Amino acid sequence: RRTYIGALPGKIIQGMKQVGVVNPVFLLDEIDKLSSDWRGDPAAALLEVL
């Protein structure tokens, strides 16, 4: 969120920050190295990404 001092909008919109155009290509490299091991599961956020 805003409040967290590790203020990250993911690495998706970091990618749109350094790209700066609304239709890039993203390489979401090594999707199969996503496990649920008490740090949260980011594959469930990739469910929103794809």
Next chain:
Amino acid sequence: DPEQNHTFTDHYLDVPYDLSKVFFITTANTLSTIPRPLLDRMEVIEIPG
């Protein structure tokens, strides 16, 4: 990563860095607990005993 060496945004400083001139050497003790994208891009030299 050389895709991100040439565009290195240290998000404290929030400025892009060109780390192509900055010459890293990674060094380690075993091949197992290096992370996997830090292995195949990386040039294994393999000093023996």
